[PDB]
Amino acid sequence: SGFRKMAFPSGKVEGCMVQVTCGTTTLNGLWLDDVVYCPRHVICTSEDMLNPNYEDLLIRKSNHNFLVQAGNVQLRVIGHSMQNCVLKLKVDTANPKTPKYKFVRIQPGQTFSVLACYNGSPSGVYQCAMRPNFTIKGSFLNGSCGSVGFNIDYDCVSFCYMHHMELPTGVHAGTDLEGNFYGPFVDRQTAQAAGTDTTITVNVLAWLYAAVINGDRWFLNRFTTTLNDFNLVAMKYNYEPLTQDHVDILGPLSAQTGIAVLDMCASLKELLQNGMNGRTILGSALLEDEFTPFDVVRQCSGVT
Amino acid sequence: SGFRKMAFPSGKVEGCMVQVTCGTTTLNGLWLDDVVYCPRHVICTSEDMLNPNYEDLLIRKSNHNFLVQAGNVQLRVIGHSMQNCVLKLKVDTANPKTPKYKFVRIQPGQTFSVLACYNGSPSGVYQCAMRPNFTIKGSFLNGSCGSVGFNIDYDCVSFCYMHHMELPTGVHAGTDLEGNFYGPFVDRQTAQAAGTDTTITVNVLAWLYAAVINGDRWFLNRFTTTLNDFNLVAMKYNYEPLTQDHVDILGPLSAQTGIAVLDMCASLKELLQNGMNGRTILGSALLEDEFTPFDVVRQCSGVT
Ligand SMILES: Cc1ccc(NC(=O)c2ccc(CN3CCN(C)CC3)cc2)cc1Nc1nc(-c2cccnc2)cs1
Ligand SMILES: Cc1ccc(NC(=O)c2ccc(CN3CCN(C)CC3)cc2)cc1Nc1nc(-c2cccnc2)cs1
């Protein structure tokens, strides 16, 4: 029983975090085999953030300009190259703690764990979702760049996010581990801002199923809706459209609770139109959209 | 920017988790130096949960009745003893991954990280608070007993909680690592239930400070209250009394925001009496009480 924002255990990633210094800029890197990955803006100056040409900036660097430290051990840099918005620093030692890993790119609406680090040292772990507008609502301070987001499946770490910047509304943007930004953001100084966002409908439905499995039932009703009629309501309240694939993905949770997806959609319509009338669902007075169907199945009992 | 329920990185504890089997019962244990700690109810049967005498049950066990597995490695048990509600299994190998550690007992209102484990294998990490009634609102399924709660300060893991049971309302109870239960609960079958709970006032105030530091200010006002007048309102809404020591503990956050504690108490009084009128604070429509002042300082910027 219970339902929490639960991250993956972080030990496999902790053993990969290093400190990268270039000039007077320090940030975090990810050490896998004999390569350290970090944001390329580590090579920038304050006089460079206006209109940087990173190809120029990197040609003017040598391996000796990069100081890499793993705990109390200095790693010797023997090669450097750019890949999109990340830097690859080849080092003379393979990381003995390298887990089985993959570099994946995630979709908006999917979740992952973030290991927030400062000066190469892990500080905390929390769960994040990629928003529809390709930002994340993280918790990061100055020094956190190069912190990573990941999921773990059996023994394998799938890295999906490296942190690069904070936008003016306080939300965060970054890249996959190939250095390609999520969303229409760049690693330079501009007036860039998060675009309009939407609520992740399939996740809200998953979380209503989690609530039923955990004994909250007050929002259920005897009505069922059609998919087209539900999607008219979704549009009005700035929810994403629900697809048949979403309905299919919710199949296991529907079977376990015996509540058809379009039955639960009729509950969600009533919550959107009427509010909660002073009640809560899984300790929240808002509809929560940062749990995927997978997250719910992973955490919740499977009985029925 | 941002504010998340953030756990401590879990790697130091992951390396301590083992599987303990006795008969057909499997649960988790904590392997530190050459001792494995686990709930003593691992030695129980279904015909024993009524009125167990654990001293009798343990006298009838031998070391060979305990199977301990660390990953794919079986640990040989060479001694067993009871300490209050935990069992200490002496093994023939010290854990090479033992961190610096302490066994601490926490106070109601304090927070800690939980590493949820199944079959000796870590599954997820989340943040928990000890409620005033000595329960925790965790996320645990069958098989999770023996999972631990902890905080980390510099290199040192302070273990404070071992999981033993789920109460009828879905909340959880357990012991410190000396085997002494938090609250009026026992590791046998009774009608025991969580007692009445209260909201942790100093934590709500800390979280309002976190909100101000993160730019939410709509709930602020020009009024200040007295401590006695605030505590009359606290009583009415089932909040704990605020003490001068609480005011002192909030000193750093008050100085950083320039908002006196009794000024912020006047905001909290208005929120309690009027609600939020459709607005949110740090993405919540409820007043959140599971962040301590320390948690806020640890996570939030320190500027001002
Ligand atoms: C996207 C980006 C692009 C360039 C930079 N770098 C800089 O602005 C910068 C870097 C280094 C310097 C110092 N110079 C270079 C070193 N030395 C020669 C002195 C002069 C001055 C400015 C940072 C970022 N990203 C940032 N992320 C944050 C941040 C804050 C809070 C949460 N998450 C991210 C702050 S700045
Ligand atoms: C407090 C307590 C006391 C005794 C027990 N153990 C049992 O009830 C029990 C243990 C073992 C058996 C099997 N027997 C012994 C082994 N073998 C001889 C077969 C017969 C039957 C029952 C469990 C607990 N705690 C439990 N925690 C949970 C639980 C569920 C979800 C979340 N957190 C905890 C379920 S039972």
CA angle B275–B276–B279, rounded 5-degree value = 165
> Pick from A194, A191, A155, A190: which is nearest to A173 by CA?
A194
Residue A214's domain comprises 201-300
Best residue of A3, A17, A139 to probe chain B, by most B CBs closer than 10 Å: A139
The dihedral formed by the CA atoms of B47, B52, B54 and B55, expressed in degrees to the nearest 10:
-110
Does the distance separating the beta carbons of B5 and A5 come in below 8 Å? yes
Handedness of CA B15, B13, A114, A166 (dihedral sign): negative
- Residue with token string 């003017």: A60
Separation of alpha carbons B93 and B75, rounded Å: 7
- φ, ψ (nearest 5 deg) of residue A122: -65, 135
Residues 6+ apart with CB under 8 A from B243: none
Does the distance separating the beta carbons of A11 and B9 come in below 8 Å? yes
Does the distance separating the beta carbons of A125 and B4 come in below 8 Å? no
Best residue of B125, B287, B296, B297 to probe chain A, by most A CBs closer than 10 Å: B125
Residues 6+ apart with CB under 8 A from B99: B12, B13, B15, B16, B155, B156, B157
Here the CATH number for the domain that contains residue B54 is 2.40.10.10
Does the distance separating the beta carbons of A9 and B10 come in below 8 Å? yes
Distance from CA of A80 to the nearest CA of B (A): 30
The dihedral formed by the CA atoms of B41, B44, B50 and B53, expressed in degrees to the nearest 10:
-80
Give SS3 for B31.
strand
CA-CA distances (angstroms) from residue B252 to B140, B248, B293, B298?
35, 8, 9, 12
Final resolution, Å: 1.6
Does the distance separating the beta carbons of B137 and A6 come in below 8 Å? no
B214 inside 8 A of chain A by CB: yes
User: Which positions in chain A touch B141 (Cβ < 8 Å)?
Assistant: 1, 301
- Residue with token string 């304090």: B110
Separation of alpha carbons B303 and B282, rounded Å: 19
Cβ(B257) – ligand 2 distance below 6 Å: no
Pocket of ligand 1 (CB under 6 A): A 23-25, 41, 44-46, 49, 140-142, 144-145, 164-166, 172, 187
Residues 6+ apart with CB under 8 A from A153: none
Residue B105, classified by CB atoms within 10 Å of its CB into exposed (0-12), middle (13-18) or buried (19+), is middle
Catalytic site includes residue A145: yes
Residue B103, classified by CB atoms within 10 Å of its CB into exposed (0-12), middle (13-18) or buried (19+), is middle
A152 inside 8 A of chain B by CB: no
Residue A301 Cα, ligand 2 centroid: separation in angstroms? Answer: 16
Residue nearest to atom 23 of ligand 2 (CA): B41
Ligand nearest to C-alpha A117: 1
Separation of alpha carbons A132 and A124, rounded Å: 25
Separation of alpha carbons A173 and A120, rounded Å: 20
Here the CATH number for the domain that contains residue A259 is 1.10.1840.10
User: Which positions in chain B touch A140 (Cβ < 8 Å)?
Assistant: 1-2
Residue A242 Cα, ligand 2 centroid: separation in angstroms? Answer: 42
Residue nearest to atom 30 of ligand 2 (CA): B142
Separation of alpha carbons A255 and A97, rounded Å: 41
